[PDB]
């Protein structure tokens, strides 16, 4: 229309508009106090209404980037508090906007946000719902300036719901805590997947991204034509590129356009899009990106038809290599929603290396003829890992299952820090308790999603404090080889045992008064230290000590003079256990 602010305000709503302006300002001006952003928001909202009333009103015709930049350059302590950023105000649009992007701190030095007691939260919530929620929305946004705003708003409403429901509960904590803990992880995962996808698009490039997308979109819309999935991969690639550059306005607009395009060609893409396409502007996109895989066509040919038996394979492949491979991927991915995207990529890479080393052969058709026989082991590796790991997980519980992983990975990389092994193994354990409850056909896609962030977080840490060449080998490896690389690690034999430290295996009754999570991590840490001291120990040998300690802990927390129990019994355990481990 003739007025940008008016337009956005109208088809967004006052509530959503006020929330996004807030998040937008908090992501740039991360150092300003809450009361300061609230003022900006009201001033901007007041302005918007003016434009809604009279489209021709002053400044209402200016662009959003321009207006946003102007108000930004209004902050008087700009230079004093953000130094260099203030010099941005001297530039002219769009150099000004670019300038702001460049000076956005992806991770400032703000104190960790602590979770207050349920009663204080619920009371603060009841006594002033709006400031309570906007204040936190502010704290979150300033700490994650690259987190897509609309996405951040979706989370806020889920938090609003948890309070509404739980603060009315008889037992508030039993209701709230589990919901908050879940919200946090779900949020952290969302954040990580976001940062992960941008980093990938930078290192590996556009080809790999597009490949990843063709596969992913084909599993979802197995009925859409290949030309549609391509049209879509092209636009999706532009969307992410932009959204990754960090410009919110461009990003949002590109996501909107794509969501409308999809909804309009709905019948030509997937049946599962009805619900999503009815929802309001601010959710259409979110819904869609989350949509379930449509049912795949009933009568579908055999891949070997056009890709192994056809006589024009090399002819069609030289014509346009990536198109052909994309086509291969499309046909392969849409017949396998049960495969992880990365697996589909491995098969395509494998099929690619073949056509390259066969279309240059005397008789092509006979050279590549048995290619599908080479997929088998590639497909089975991940399947067997899942079955084998999910079985074990059902035998033991989440907690005990995490201990098994602890022993397993400490042996593979004893050089890694003890608290890093516990963090990683616990998170790994969670992926098992989340994906194993799924029926086989959805397990692999599930593990991939969760495993990708855990492996990324793991690599980041190590990036900072490098400790093993192998981990760096796996971490800097190709995205498609990453997990198989870690799966291929073997017990470290070069490793030299950690010297026995008395303290490290001493325990006081305080563990008794500690919370479930606290006890576990307390035990799990000793478990890692144990394996680092006796790496050549056997599961049996180990299993014995563990269960001994196990009891010793209970048999002392449910005992009279607890401290002596741990002191006297503890002297014994350590003494015997060492004997058992020679
Ligand atoms: C690398 C992480 C990809 C996340 C993602 C996704 O799955 N869809 C997506 C894209 C096409 C079909 C189905 C889902 N879109 C997306 C959704 C809505 C929109 O309007 C713009 C883009 C995405 O950004
Ligand atoms: C008789 C069936 C044995 C199954 C079993 C197993 O594989 N681990 C096990 C034992 C040692 C190393 C790795 C795994 N432990 C176990 C697991 C967690 C725990 O905290 C205590 C013990 C077991 O009890
Ligand atoms: C989304 C913005 C609203 C957040 C309000 C909930 C407060 C809890 C935040 C503390 C984070 C945590 O759970 O560790
Ligand atoms: C003023 C700044 C508000 C701009 C946000 C527009 C919201 C568009 C939603 C796009 C999407 O579906 O992701
Ligand atoms: C238009 C569709 C583009 C997709 C091209 C297919 C290429 C698949 C190769 C497998 C990807 C491995 C990633 C990589 O090594 O770059
Ligand atoms: C603990 C649960 C382990 C999950 C098995 C890993 C399977 C990885 C699937 C992703 C891939 O294909 O690389
Ligand atoms: C540090 C510990 C390394 C983490 C390795 C976990 C990788 C998961 C792949 C599953 C497997 O095959 O074990
Ligand atoms: C070499 C002497 C040190 C032995 C001390 C045993 C400490 C190991 C703790 C094992 C944790 C048990 C976990 C559980 O509760 O199942």
Curated annotation (Swiss-Prot):
Q: Where is this site: Aspirin-acetylated lysine?
A: 197
What does altering residue 534 to E do? Answer: In Castel di Sangro
- Residues that, per the record, bind (4Z,15Z)-bilirubin IXalpha: 238
A GO term from the CC aspect: endoplasmic reticulum
- Glycosylated residues, per the record, are 10, 49, 135, 160, 197, 223, 231, 274, 279, 311, 315-316, 321, 349, 376, 411, 437, 442, 492, 523, 532, 534, 543, 571
> Which CDD domains does the record cross-reference, listed alphabetically?
ALBUMIN
**What Pfam families does the annotation carry?**
Serum_albumin (PF00273)
Task: List residues, modification Phosphoserine.
Answer: 3, 56, 63, 271, 417, 487
Q: Where does Zn(2+) bind?
A: 65, 245, 247
Which amino acids does the record list as binding Ca(2+) 1? 4, 242, 247, 250
Q: What is the effect of changing residue 352 to K?
A: In Hiroshima-1
Q: Which disease is it linked to?
A: Hyperthyroxinemia, familial dysalbuminemic: A disorder characterized by abnormally elevated levels of total serum thyroxine (T4) in euthyroid patients. It is due to abnormal serum albumin that binds T4 with enhanced affinity. Analbuminemia: A rare autosomal recessive disorder manifested by the presence of a very low amount of circulating serum albumin. Affected individuals manifest mild edema, hypotension, fatigue, and, occasionally, lower body lipodystrophy (mainly in adult females). The most common biochemical finding is hyperlipidemia, with a significant increase in the total and LDL cholesterol concentrations, but normal concentrations of HDL cholesterol and triglycerides.
Record's protein name: Albumin
Q: Which gene encodes it?
A: ALB
């Amino acid at each position: 229309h003739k007025s940008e602010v008016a337009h956005r305000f109208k088809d967004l709503g006052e509530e959503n508009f006020k929330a996004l302006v807030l998040i937008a300002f908090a992501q740039y001006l991360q150092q300003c106090p809450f009361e300061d952003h609230v003022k900006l928001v009201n001033e901007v909202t007041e302005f918007a209404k003016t434009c809604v009333a009279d489209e021709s009103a002053e400044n209402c015709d200016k662009s959003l980037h321009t207006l946003f930049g102007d108000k930004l350059c209004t902050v008087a302590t700009l230079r004093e508090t953000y130094g260099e950023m203030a010099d941005c105000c001297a530039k002219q649009e769009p150099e000004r906007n670019e300038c702001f992007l460049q000076h956005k701190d992806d991770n400032p030095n703000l104190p960790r946000l602590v979770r207050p007691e349920v009663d204080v939260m619920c009371t603060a919530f009841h006594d002033n719902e709006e400031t309570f929620l906007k204040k936190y929305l502010y704290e979150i946004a300033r700490r994650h300036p690259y987190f897509y705003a609309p996405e951040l708003l979706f989370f806020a409403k889920r938090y609003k719901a948890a309070f509404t429901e739980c603060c009315q509960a008889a037992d508030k904590a039993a209701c709230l805590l589990p919901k908050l803990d879940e919200l946090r992880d779900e949020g952290k995962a969302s954040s990580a997947k976001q940062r992960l996808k941008c980093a990938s698009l930078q290192k590996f490039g556009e080809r790999a991204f597009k490949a990843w997308a063709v596969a992913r979109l084909s599993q979802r819309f197995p009925k859409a034509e290949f030309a549609e999935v391509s049209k879509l991969v092209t636009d999706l690639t532009k969307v992410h590129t932009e959204c990754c550059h960090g410009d919110l306005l461009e990003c949002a607009d590109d996501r909107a356009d794509l969501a409308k395009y999809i909804c309009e060609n709905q019948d030509s893409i997937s049946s599962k899009l009805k619900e999503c396409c009815e929802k309001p502007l601010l959710e259409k996109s979110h819904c869609i990106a989350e949509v379930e895989n449509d049912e795949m066509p009933a009568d579908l040919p055999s891949l070997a038809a056009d890709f192994v038996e056809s006589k024009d394979v090399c002819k069609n492949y030289a014509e346009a290599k990536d198109v052909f491979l994309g086509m291969f991927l499309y046909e392969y991915a849409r017949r396998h929603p049960d495969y992880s995207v990365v697996l589909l990529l491995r098969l395509a890479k494998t099929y690619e290396t073949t056509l390259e080393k066969c279309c240059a052969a005397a008789d092509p058709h006979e050279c590549y003829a048995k290619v599908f026989d080479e997929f088998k082991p590639l497909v089975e590796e991940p399947q067997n890992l899942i079955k084998q790991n999910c079985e074990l997980f059902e035998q033991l519980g989440e907690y005990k299952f995490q201990n098994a992983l602890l022993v397993r990975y400490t042996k593979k990389v004893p050089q890694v820090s003890t608290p890093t092994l516990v963090e990683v193994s616990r998170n790994l354990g969670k992926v098992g308790s989340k994906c194993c409850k799924h029926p086989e056909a959805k397990r692999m896609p599930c593990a991939e999603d969760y495993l990708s962030v855990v492996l990324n977080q793991l690599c980041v840490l190590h990036e900072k404090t490098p400790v093993s060449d192998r981990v760096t080998k796996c971490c800097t490896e190709s995205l498609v080889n990453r997990r198989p690389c870690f799966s291929a690690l073997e017990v470290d034999e070069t490793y030299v045992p950690k010297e026995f430290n008395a303290e490290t295996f001493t325990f006081h009754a305080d563990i008794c008064t500690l919370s479930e999570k606290e006890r576990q991590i307390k035990k799990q840490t000793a478990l890692v230290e144990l394996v680092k001291h006796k790496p050549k120990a056997t599961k049996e040998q180990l299993k014995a000590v563990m269960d001994d300690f196990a009891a010793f802990v209970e048999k002392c927390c449910k005992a009279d003079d607890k401290e002596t129990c741990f002191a006297e019994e503890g002297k014994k355990l350590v003494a015997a256990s060492q004997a058992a481990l020679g």
